[PDB]
Ligand binder design. Structure first.
Ligand SMILES: CC(=O)N[C@H]1/C(=N/OC(=O)Nc2ccccc2)O[C@H](CO)[C@@H](O)[C@@H]1O
Ligand SMILES: [Ca+2]
Length: 882
């Protein structure tokens, strides 16, 4: 050994009674620790630093277990030293793991799998090593106050000094040019501040007289919109840092000709759903955020949801009410779940966050507010409605809370009673006062716009009056910022008129009609004289598929402007920004007109600048897309139609996610014609990346569509009990998925490995524990979402399903192959079992890039034209009989 038989202790973050953590180290094989929740790990302190040579683990039974062992010599960093990932059963002899004489004062054992239960266990753990004579070192989470930073000095300088602020802005608009099209095009522009045009945001583009482009605008985003206007209408250039670009500039800067002056009737152009921060932006670095804000300003956006670094604000707030930093970390979710954590739906899951997290994200948020200030983009910060942890009373006995029940199998945080009786302590007032103060401490006065949404998708209003709740929440927000505007989401008829009528100051609230392009609900808001924004939702969960509503955008936005007195803006509220760039380009365009436009000729113009060129055939393919996947519909529907490939296998499947659809409302063979045309023009257009993007989009749409048809043939073949029929069609079905995987390999944005690597690398000098945990977050979100009770009982299984390379191969295909094998076995042998899908899915979720399989961050050289012809030939609906 030698075995460390003394001074060793252990902690855990949950257990089923009375299977406490100490039962893992009590020398007794008949006693065990057992997990109760999603913290499936224990932490052994060794009473000093040892050089470990061996670690021995015993489980309570003969099930197959999988786990990862991490160690620390500094008490801060936990690095992986051992793991079990083989399918061998536990037995009476235990598992012995050799350690490379690694210095360790603490150990973590994360038992990520148990073949017999959702719940995990360690009966005993023995650690063998050589005592170093040393002891683990002492360090507390500490963050800077905004006012004490270079950010505050800069922020105030912009605020007080007009000439400085203008210089800063103009220089930023110029840096934007250098980032977007290249440094060599920067001095080809002259940027000027002008006034508003009758109280409206405005830009101008004209010729300087010496071959440069002169652009005027009342602020940053107006300038960047003039820049984009020039690129789009004169340079035939189209920028989308997420969904494909044409950035090929002419040899000479083209002349503007006659001067243009373009204003917008809208006070706000809005961007972001709480969900975007999770489904898309979870693992974004500053570079990705910088890109995004350039694209924002260029698209006219001046109002943007901002929850970056809100974990520090909450930490400082909770610290005042009896919570340690560790307890705060247990409250807050992991980095993929902030959407539903800030919307009061869930706690804990994916966590705990590393100690490093707090400072890094406060800094990222300060960085973002600096650029936003330069552009004149208002962030929407956080308001406070009463959200507290479920043990808030234990720590603050006089506090009055309301249990909020569950959300999709998760426990919702409590909610402080917004008001109490006389003679009762008012903890809404105490905690709200701290919250707004700590939010100032972390970021300063950066905005008058605050977002909070009590009772989002459920909860419980207890004994309280609905209107009185919304009266007090607003009054309190205005208390700490007299100019405050409470940004309120409008989702599925909530908040009701009765909550909304509680708003005593209508000017200081702004309601986001979240789903205005499928299900508008602004009439109720307009009738109550409430300022409101018209929003395109479009995207649910980052689910992919050809789908957009260009005609409604072209018509309904200007029509709403004319039919109303309280529409203060338009915007986007997608759950992910990863799909259908047409929709988002058209919506932000609709801000700069009071008249309806022609969606058909708009598209004709759009595709030319996107591909860099156009022709008769490419146009007619896009008309086919407009006539099919993009055709105006009048039904209710959430998201693009879902692919059967991404569905949990079975009979009578009508979607992949619980409240989704797989119904194709257009003619499939008609849509396939677009792919024929794209393939026919491939060689001419392959120099365009945005063309390849769209080709991959419609081609993977073609194969999703045909897969559905093939699935029904093979289902009919089994239900008719033969047989070698089934083998054939089931085999052609799996072959189709293998072709799909090749299609998806062509796009960097469709690679699972990019999502995952971004998770593992988003902070620097992270230990293996943090990287592994963040990869858990990335895997789980796009698949099971949560654990068994969240995936199954909760309805969240495959909610965020992705048509992604690697994921399709190792997860979607694998599910379908097992089920086929399957039915075949029976049809020949009998009979086919019930497959416990979650088990199989969570197997993949818990795999790690460094020990299991590293997914590529690099696209393939596969030929889409060629791939398209293979699709038309063998895997199409058009040729489906042959
Ligand atoms: C799981 C998830 O992300 N659900 C989101 C969500 N789900 O909406 C649905 O697709 N449908 C659905 C919503 C409520 C009840 C049943 C289905 O939309 C809301 C607004 O975009 C978000 O606030 C919810 O977080
Ligand atoms: Ca024991």
């Amino acid at each position: 050994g030698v075995e460390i038989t003394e001074g060793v202790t252990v902690t855990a973050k949950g257990n089923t009674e009375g299977n406490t953590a100490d039962l893992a180290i009590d020398g007794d094989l008949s006693t065990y620790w057992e997990s109760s929740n999603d913290y499936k790990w224990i932490e052994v302190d060794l009473g000093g630093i040892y050089e470990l040579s061996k670690i021995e683990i015993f489980n309570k039974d003969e099930a197959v277990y999988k786990y990862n062992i991490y160690a620390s010599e500094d008490g801060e960093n936990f690095n992986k030293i051992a793991y079990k990932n083989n399918d061998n059963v536990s037995d009476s002899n235990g598992n012995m793991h050799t350690i490379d004489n690694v210095r360790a004062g603490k150990i973590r054992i994360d038992v990520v799998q148990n073949s017999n239960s959702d719940r995990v266990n360690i009966a005993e753990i023995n650690v063998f090593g050589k005592n170093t004579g040393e002891s683990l070192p002492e360090k507390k989470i500490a963050t800077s106050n905004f006012s004490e930073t270079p950010w505050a000095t800069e922020y105030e300088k912009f605020n007080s000094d007009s000439a400085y602020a203008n210089e800063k802005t103009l220089n930023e608009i110029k840096n934007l040019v250098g980032r977007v099209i290249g440094r060599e095009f920067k001095d080809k522009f002259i940027f000027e501040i002008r006034d508003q045009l009758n109280g409206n945001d405005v830009f101008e583009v004209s010729d300087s007289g010496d071959g440069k482009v002169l652009i005027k605008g009342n602020n940053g985003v107006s300038l960047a919109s003039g820049f984009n206007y020039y690129l789009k209408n004169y340079c035939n250039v189209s920028y989308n840092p997420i969904m494909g670009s044409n950035l090929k500039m002419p040899e000479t800067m083209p002349s503007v000709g006659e001067r243009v002056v373009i204003d917008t009737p809208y006070e706000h152009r809005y961007a972001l759903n709480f969900c975007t921060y999770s489904y898309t932006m979870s693992f974004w670095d500053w570079d990705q955020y910088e890109e995004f804000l350039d694209w924002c300003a260029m698209n006219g956006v001046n109002l943007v949801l901002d929850i970056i670094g809100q974990e520090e604000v909450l930490r400082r707030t909770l610290n005042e009410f009896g919570y340690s930093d560790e307890e705060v970390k247990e409250f807050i979710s992991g980095p993929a779940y902030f959407a539903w954590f800030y919307m009061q739906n869930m706690t804990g899951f994916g966590g705990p966050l590393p100690n490093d997290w707090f400072e890094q994200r406060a800094e990222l948020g300060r960085k973002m507010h600096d650029r936003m200030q330069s552009f004149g983009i208002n962030p929407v910060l956080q308001g406070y409605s009463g959200m507290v942890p479920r043990d808030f009373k234990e720590k603050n006995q006089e506090a009055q809370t309301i249990s909020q029940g569950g959300w999709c199998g998760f426990d919702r945080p409590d909610m402080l009673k917004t008001y109490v009786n006389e003679g009762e302590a008012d903890y809404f007032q105490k905690v709200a006062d701290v919250f707004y103060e700590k939010q100032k401490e972390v970021f300063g006065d950066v905005t008058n716009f605050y977002g909070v949404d009590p009772f989002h998708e459920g909860g419980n209003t207890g004994d309280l009056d609905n209107g009185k709740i919304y009266e007090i929440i607003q009054n309190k927000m205005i208390e700490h910022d007299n100019d405050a505007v409470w940004v309120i989401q409008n989702w599925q008829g909530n908040p009701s008129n009765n909550k909304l009528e509680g708003l005593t100051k209508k000017d200081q609230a702004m309601v986001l009609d979240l789903f205005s392009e499928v299900s508008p609900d602004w009439n109720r808001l307009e009738e109550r004289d409430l300022p409101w924004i018209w929003n395109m939702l479009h995207n649910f969960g980052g689910r992919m598929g050809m789908d957009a509503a260009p005609e409604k955008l072209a018509t309904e936005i200007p029509k709403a402007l004319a039919n109303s007195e309280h529409m203060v803006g338009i915007g986007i509220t997608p759950e992910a920004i990863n799909t259908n760039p047409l929709a988002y380009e058209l919506l932000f365009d609709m801000a700069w007109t009071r008249d309806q436009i022609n969606f058909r000729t708009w598209t004709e113009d759009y595709i030319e600048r996107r591909y860099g060129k156009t022709n008769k055939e490419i146009l007619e393919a896009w008309n086919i897309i407009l006539d099919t996947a993009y055709k105006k519909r009048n039904d209710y529907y959430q998201g693009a139609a879902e692919s059967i490939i991404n569905a949990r296998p079975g009979f009578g499947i009508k979607s992949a996610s619980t409240w989704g659809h797989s119904k194709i409302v257009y003619d499939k063979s008609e849509f396939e014609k677009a792919i024929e045309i794209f393939a026919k023009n491939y060689d001419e257009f392959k120099d365009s990346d945005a063309f390849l993007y769209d080709f991959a989009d419609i081609l993977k749409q073609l194969l999703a569509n045909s897969a559905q048809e093939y699935y029904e043939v093979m289902c009919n073949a089994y239900n008719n009990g033969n047989g070698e029929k089934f083998k054939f069609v089931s085999g052609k079905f799996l072959e189709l998925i293998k072709l799909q995987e090749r299609v998806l390999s062509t796009r960097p944005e469709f690679l699972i490995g990019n999502w995952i690597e971004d998770a593992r690398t988003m902070l620097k000098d992270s230990d293996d524990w943090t990287k592994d945990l963040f990869e858990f977050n990335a895997r789980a979100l796009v698949t099971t979402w949560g654990s068994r009770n969240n995936a199954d009982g909760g309805g969240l299984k495959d909610y965020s399903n992705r048509q992604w390379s690697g994921l399709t191969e190792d997860y979607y295909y694998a599910r379908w192959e097992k089920w086929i094998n399957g039915l075949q076995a029976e049809l020949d042998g009998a009979k086919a079992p019930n497959i416990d899908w979650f088990k199989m899915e969570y197997d993949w979720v818990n795999k790690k890039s460094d020990t299991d399989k590293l997914y590529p961050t690099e696209a393939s050289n596969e030929n889409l034209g060629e791939l398209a012809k293979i699709a038309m030939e063998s895997y199409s609906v058009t040729n489906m009989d042959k």
